[PDB]
């Protein structure tokens, strides 16, 4: 609220929240946010009317409104504002998909069906998920995604940089039968998405959080990758690049294993560094633990990509499903290593 | 009628086996076992069936119209199978043993748990009193061993102690005073609690890694490294074949059913890992 | 906010009057609109005497009573006899809430002694004798919500409901 | 089963890391950590144990240098070569030993404190040595891990 | 009275039409009902109770020719009941106790309603805690190549229970009691088998709520079909309704009759009952009359166990 | 014939006493055995109220009181509030039925009436908190049924089912 | 109150009066379980006196005196200065445990002063000579245990047992 306005107006509304502030009083702290707009008034020179009675009142009411039952009130503009956001947001996913070779089933603004080949299956989500916040590098068309917004020569249209998305990955052979495997895909962007829960925090404190992943399945191979670890996905500029920062290390750990730097017994080898490595309680154990690791495949000559130690404590939990997942963040990366190679 | 007759029996490893489910769990392990509802490494009634008849339609070519007819057919296949396999699930399996005690020596042991002997009792009772087949000792010693669920018992032995699969120290206690071998291999067996039992098992299993060399400058083709599982020689499974009555049933459970010892189950059999010893309970 | 009150609906004519309100709150219970009978409270797990009229409350969830929240105040008179409750009103179990309450309510609720005097067995009854179906509509529907014969010329919907959307679990002990 | 081992190895070690500086006797602990395992269950764990023993200082330097260790904080263990570097690993052992009820501290304690029961402390551990082995194998490759990866 | 059902293994209720290798570009695949159909049930009771010389036409004729009026299936654990439930799409194991609050609950107000039914479906629900789906994958294999044949891969949600899992019916005469009491018997898709253990009970029928569960799959008559579909509200507060099939008659090896109904686990206002009884020709309600000894129209209140027909 | 008695279980340990002597009676419906908490009742209709503790009713099958049927008369100094009624066993809804059914119940109920005062914010809440669950052992499971810790060495289960068997909507404020 | 009481085993027979609860009750901390006798807690850091046996307090760790356990207290014409003392029962070092005990101990050490007059010249001393045994199986088993000569006719277990252990260190002076 207090950075939805643009000016001096600010003030009024924030004091005006604090008036709200613990019950404070209505009826009496209507004077120290009224010397200002009675100040503003008498500021100008053809004022008519004031009944700053009934209108700080009313202004009062609006947010207290707001606050008691919990949501910000809907008017029609917010609706066509997130429908257009959604209708631009689909323009640009359906040149991500041309983009990566895929051919689209339905996407429709919020959701996508498409089909891609599986070596550009995790560029796209990457890309994706960064897109439907408005933050990419590329040109789609006569659209120019700029930081939360959409640049579209000259005309800034919003995006949805609040809003998660989940995403499904099915593996499937091209004789699998289309109903279990559209089902599949379905079941788990349904369940998985109401059912899991891994560690976020917001405000310094390590909560929960469920939405906002990807999963993926390889005939039997379930991995999860969480795709904000902040659960005000976005609330500066700067967060902007955060998402999807865990598919871009899985994709560069990819990059190393197919020119012949690591060894996939990567992929067979985390298990025994697990245990040692979830007990573990400092950072930079953890760090050279890791990196030790890896230096068992060895990733490198000196070497140089290590895991950006945002990664660990990260724990995946599920409400007691079929689905069976690692409870840490890079088993789940080396999963989704193992699913994404075992369909190619 | 309508499974009138039932023969349970012993599926022992003569090597290690491979009943593959292609990726079809969690672990580390990319060629897993087939996996019971508990984890615990089973043998589908499918595979088990599809390679006994197999095998049953090599080695007996002139009796291929009794198998047929006992195990299904391959075209005309609206003529129900008068013979059925249940799933084959893991009875006992071999581990290390680092005894501490009993002044007898043994460097492997038998291990369950009582989650196995919980199923197995489960195919044992809906057998016996139901069919006419008599074999009531076998789930006499299975109760009695069911008994004492919750602690780690040693059976026919002198333990009371020991280290299992290099990692594991347990402390054992004999049954009552003795009681007759379920196994006839002169080995003990320890049932173990279902926690610790379980440990001592997916620590009994084989899970090598494998590779395939690049044929000219003999080093490791890029990605040709993977991992399988294999259920270790000995290891011991539990099935039946329930029989429903008919005159070639007589056939199948008199000239074939009597001359089946070894056969091939699984995959890999190029690395050797299928052959297999079934023991009727009948003897 | 407003006090509303306890009444059950059988073939039994013997409650018209004691809720001494005839028009009572901006609010309204149960209003109609020339569909039926709508916004009935339906209570769980207390049978009825239906003769001599004290609902002895039993411990078996599947009997009910199918009441109305009764405008207005218990005639003040009585409630060293009933119970009564002030609920935070999202409790009460109403039937195709037409409208919207702003779950504030007090309710007083007759009562009866547990009657340890006989053993207890319950029966199921439904409205029968259409014409005692009117005349129920007469003694105690009409005074409390006159809106019917005000607005209402049709009576082939809003008497013939009541025909089976209330059934109860009666004593007879 | 073992699963706190590797929380028992924090509070345990407490230092053999920072503490153990000058990078001699501080880098030296991983041959501790490698070999002594290969050691440990090539040759047996009771001759590993004589081994470490015969390089402890055990007067009351090499007696009590440790058994702070069990109180207050972390033991800058400089002294001498590694014989304070050594008795930590001593300390270590029967740290595990003792926080796993193998064998108990009013023994322990009572055992390294009149040198007639020194001796049959390690008359004891020669019984225990198959189970203590077989237990301490994942607390030990745990600090064998930590060696390659931190020390 | 009561006869309880115990699978010695994963079982396969399969839920669709075909499951073999018709394509030849194409795997097949089959996913395992969670409970019975009562045609499954019935038809194994009537396998064991076979007569050579009766029938031959409308199955159920001969079927019912030998049955009692077959009361729906539920799961019991370890003497323990659990009792299905069913919304769009979803499907739930819960026990007695939960369905007390559910019809005030789905008249609870919009956000209190979705989330106490919400929690009724994902920590309430005991299914995957005692049932769950065990993948399956088979092949072919071509005797000359001792390779896979073409494509001939299929795969088969199993029924895998991690517990001890009985599945209940309770059924009225008693010389059929003790004429199959532990039969060994192939109850189920794809040969699986479970044993038959019969114990004689009692529980109460004449019951009528305002609400029922269905413990069985309601048949609709497809005469009263849009007088259904025009207004579902009237019958059903939550479940699903379905495209059904029969199932598979065995004696002449057809697919039985494709007919609408009401999936079990779905909760059917009484409304329902007369409606019913109040749509239907003598001649159908012959055929239903049977369709109903099978045990298809069978409610459980959420009260009590309350045992209930529809149309009896 | 006996006569039993549903005594709550809230948070509180308000459940040390509700009988004089140890057992008493002759028999017992409800049973401790190896496998479950065999025979509870859950009531319906009502709340708890963990300190001052007793019932506090608040109408609807959402509320619920979960309690056990014991043999014992209610401390001989009041039954003024406690319910005393008779029911013929089969409106006795038991959760996991296993024993014998009596036909002639007879129950005594710990209870204060409503009493009207404050908004019944009515919360449920779990049977947790291992520290405040364990020392309930031989005070709410031996102080009337001194059958367990007798031949079961099996109560780490039938307190599994402790974590979950008790439930209810308390009164808090 | 949980109470104990301490009574050394040296050759010397001098604890034959300070008995009061030979039995007295259904258990002791030491016994016999056909595999040793169990349980024997010492005390470390005390010498015995042959003249007026009883423990005296040194500061040497190891000058230690094994001592049997049982459920005693020594008839109350004693403890007026003995070592009258109550315990966690976990901080006790207690040789072959094999039952452990109830965190809290009214134990009693037959205490001497600490007598500056001489200094001490101690000598661990190990018992043999079965002349001096003998006495021993009436003269404190018979005394005290429930099970004596009940279970023991196969005497050799708490002979080399009692042999094997029970050391001491004494000021032999
Ligand atoms: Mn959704």
Redesign the interface.
């Given at each position: 609220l207090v950075n939805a306005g643009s000016g001096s107006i600010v003030d009024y509304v924030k004091t005006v929240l604090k008036c709200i502030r613990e019950n404070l009083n209505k009826c009496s702290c209507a004077e120290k946010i009224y010397s200002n707009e009675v100040a503003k008034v008498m500021f100008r020179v053809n004022v008519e009317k004031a009944n700053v009675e009934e209108e700080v009142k009313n202004s009062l009411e609006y947010f207290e409104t707001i606050l008691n039952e919990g949501r910000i009130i809907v008017t029609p503009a917010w609706h066509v504002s997130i429908s257009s956001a959604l209708n631009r947001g689909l323009l640009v996913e359906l040149e991500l998909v041309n983009k990566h070779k895929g051919f689209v089933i339905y996407a429709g603004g919020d959701d996508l069906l498409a089909m891609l080949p599986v070596d550009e299956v995790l560029d796209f989500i990457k890309e994706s998920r960064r897109a439907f916040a408005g933050f990419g590098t590329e040109k789609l068309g006569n659209m120019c995604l700029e930081n939360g917004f959409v640049r579209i020569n000259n005309a800034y249209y919003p995006s949805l940089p609040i809003v998660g998305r989940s995403y499904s990955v099915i593996i499937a052979?091209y004789?699998?039968?289309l109903?279990?495997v559209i089902n599949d895909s379905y079941n788990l962007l349904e369940e998985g998405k109401?059912?899991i829960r891994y560690r976020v925090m917001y405000n310094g404190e390590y909560k929960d959080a469920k939405k906002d992943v990807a999963i993926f399945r390889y005939?039997?191979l379930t991995s999860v990758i969480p795709l904000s670890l902040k659960r005000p996905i976005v609330s500066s500029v700067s967060d902007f690049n955060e998402i999807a920062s865990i598919i871009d290390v899985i994709l560069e750990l990819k990059k190393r294993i197919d020119e012949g730097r690591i060894s996939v017994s990567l992929l067979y080898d985390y298990e025994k560094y697990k245990h040692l490595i979830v007990a573990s309680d400092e950072k930079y154990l953890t760090e050279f633990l890791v990196k030790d690791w890896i230096k068992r495949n060895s990733l490198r000559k000196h070497v140089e990509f290590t895991i950006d130690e945002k990664l660990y404590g990260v724990r995946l939990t599920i409400?007691?499903?079929?689905i069976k997942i690692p409870n840490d963040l890079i088993s789940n990366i080396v999963y989704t290593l193992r699913i994404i190679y075992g369909g190619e | 009628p309508?499974?009138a007759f039932?023969e349970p029996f012993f599926i022992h490893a003569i090597t290690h086996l491979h009943v593959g489910?292609?990726s079809?769990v969690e672990e580390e392990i990319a060629l897993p076992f087939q996996r019971?509802?508990?984890g615990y490494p089973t043998i589908?009634?499918?595979?088990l069936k599809?390679a006994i008849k197999?095998f049953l339609?090599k080695e007996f070519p002139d009796k291929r119209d009794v198998i047929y007819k006992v195990l299904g057919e391959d075209e005309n296949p609206?003529e129900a199978?008068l013979g059925?396999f249940?799933?084959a699930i893991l009875f006992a399996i071999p581990s290390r043993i680092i005894e501490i005690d009993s002044a007898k020596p043994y460097v492997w042991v038998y291990v369950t748990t009582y989650e196995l002997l919980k199923k197995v009792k489960?195919?044992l009772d809906?057998?016996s009193?139901?069919?006419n087949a008599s074999f009531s000792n076998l789930k006499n010693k299975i109760d009695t061993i069911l008994a004492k669920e919750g602690k780690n018992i040693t059976l026919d032995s002198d333990l009371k102690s020991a280290i299992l699969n290099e990692d594991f120290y347990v402390e054992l206690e004999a049954l009552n005073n003795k009681i007759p071998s379920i196994i006839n291999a002169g080995v003990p067996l320890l049932v173990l609690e279902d926690s610790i039992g379980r440990e001592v098992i997916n620590r009994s299993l084989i899970r090598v890694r494998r590779i395939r060399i690049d044929r000219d400058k003999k080093v490791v083709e890029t990605g040709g490294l993977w991992s399988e599982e294999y259920v270790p020689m000995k290891t011991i499974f539990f099935s039946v074949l329930?029989g429903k009555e008919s005159k070639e049933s007589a056939i199948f459970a008199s000239c074939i059913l009597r001359n089946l010892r070894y056969v091939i189950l699984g995959g890999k059999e190029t690395i050797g890992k299928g052959i297999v010893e079934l023991r009727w309970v009948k003897d | 906010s407003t006090q509303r009150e306890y009444v059950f609906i059988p073939i039994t004519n013997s409650i018209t009057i004691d809720v001494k309100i005839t028009i009572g709150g901006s609010d309204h219970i149960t209003n109609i609109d020339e569909r039926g009978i709508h916004n009935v409270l339906?209570i769980?797990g207390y049978a009825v005497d239906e003769k001599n009229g004290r609902l002895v409350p039993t411990l078996?969830?599947?009997d009910?009573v199918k009441g109305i929240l009764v405008a207005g105040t218990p005639q003040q008179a009585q409630s060293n006899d009933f119970l009564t409750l002030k609920l935070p009103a999202?409790k009460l179990?109403?039937?195709?809430?037409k409208g919207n309450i702003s779950d504030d309510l007090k309710i007083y609720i007759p009562y009866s002694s547990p009657d340890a005097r006989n053993s207890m067995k319950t029966k199921?009854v439904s409205i029968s004798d259409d014409t005692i179906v009117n005349n129920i509509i007469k003694e105690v529907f009409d005074k409390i919500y006159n809106i019917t014969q005000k607005e209402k010329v049709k009576i082939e919907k809003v008497k013939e409901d009541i025909k089976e959307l209330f059934s109860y679990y009666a004593l007879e002990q | 089963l073992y699963e706190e081992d590797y929380k028992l190895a924090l509070e345990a070690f407490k230092k053999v890391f920072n503490a153990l500086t000058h990078y001699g006797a501080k880098q030296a602990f991983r041959s501790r950590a490698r070999d002594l395992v290969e050691e440990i269950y090539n040759s047996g764990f009771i001759p590993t144990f004589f081994y470490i023993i015969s390089k402890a200082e055990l007067n009351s330097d090499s007696l009590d240098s440790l058994i702070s260790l069990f109180s207050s904080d972390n033991a800058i263990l400089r002294g001498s070569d590694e014989n304070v570097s050594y008795s930590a690993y001593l300390f270590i052992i029967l740290y595990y030993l003792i926080k796993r009820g193998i064998i108990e501290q009013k023994f322990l304690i009572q055992a390294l404190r009149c040198e007639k029961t020194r001796l049959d402390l390690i008359d004891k551990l020669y019984n225990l040595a198959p189970i203590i082995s077989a237990k301490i194998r994942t607390y030990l490759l745990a600090i064998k891990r930590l060696s390659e990866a931190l020390i | 009275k009561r006869v309880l059902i115990?699978p010695?293994?994963?079982l396969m209720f399969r839920s669709?039409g075909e499951f073999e290798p018709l394509i030849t570009?194409?795997?097949?695949?089959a996913?395992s009902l969670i409970i019975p159909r009562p045609s499954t049930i019935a038809g194994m009771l009537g396998?064991?109770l076979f007569n050579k010389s009766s029938g031959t036409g409308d199955w159920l004729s001969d079927l019912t020719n030998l049955l009692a009026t077959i009361y729906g299936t539920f799961i019991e654990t370890?003497?323990?009941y659990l009792f299905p439930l069913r919304m769009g799409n979803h499907l739930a194991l819960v026990d007695?106790?939960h369905l007390?609050?559910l019809?005030?609950?789905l008249?609870?107000?919009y956000e209190?309603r979705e989330k106490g039914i919400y929690e009724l479906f994902?920590?309430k629900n005991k299914l995957?805690?005692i049932i769950?789906?065990?993948?399956?994958?088979?092949i072919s294999?071509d005797?000359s190549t001792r390779t896979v044949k073409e494509?001939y891969?299929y795969?088969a949600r199993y029924l895998?229970?991690?517990k001890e899992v009985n599945y209940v019916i309770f059924i009225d005469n008693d010389a059929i009691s003790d004429k199959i009491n532990?039969?060994?018997?192939?109850f189920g898709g794809?040969?699986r088998?479970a044993?038959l253990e019969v114990d004689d009970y009692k529980v109460?029928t004449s019951?009528?709520?305002?609400y029922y569960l269905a413990l069985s799959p309601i048949l609709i008559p497809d005469e009263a079909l849009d007088n259904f579909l025009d207004n579902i509200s009237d019958y059903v507060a939550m479940g699903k309704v379905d495209k059904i099939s029969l199932g598979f008659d065995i004696a002449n090896?057809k697919r039985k009759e494709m007919l609408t109904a009401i999936l079990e686990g779905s909760i059917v206002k009484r409304s329902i009952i007369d409606f019913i009884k109040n749509e239907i020709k003598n001649d159908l309600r012959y055929r239903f009359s049977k369709y109903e000894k099978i045990g298809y129209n069978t409610l459980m209140?959420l009260?009590?166990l309350?045992l209930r027909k529809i149309l009896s």
């Open positions: 052979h004789a699998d039968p109903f279990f109401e059912i005939q039997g409400e007691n499903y079929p | 309508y499974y039932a489910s292609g079809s019971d509802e508990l589908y009634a499918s595979s599809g197999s339609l609206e199978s059925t249940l799933d489960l195919y809906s057998i009193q139901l069919s329930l | 339906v769980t078996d969830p599947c009910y999202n179990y109403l039937i195709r809430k199921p | - | 115990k010695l293994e994963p669709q570009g194409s795997h097949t695949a996913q396998y064991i370890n003497g323990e007695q106790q007390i609050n019809p005030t609950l008249e609870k107000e209190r994902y920590d995957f805690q769950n789906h065990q993948d399956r994958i088979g294999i005797k494509h891969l795969s895998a229970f991690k532990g039969k060994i018997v192939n794809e040969n088998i044993k109460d019951i009528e709520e305002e090896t209140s009260c009590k309350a």
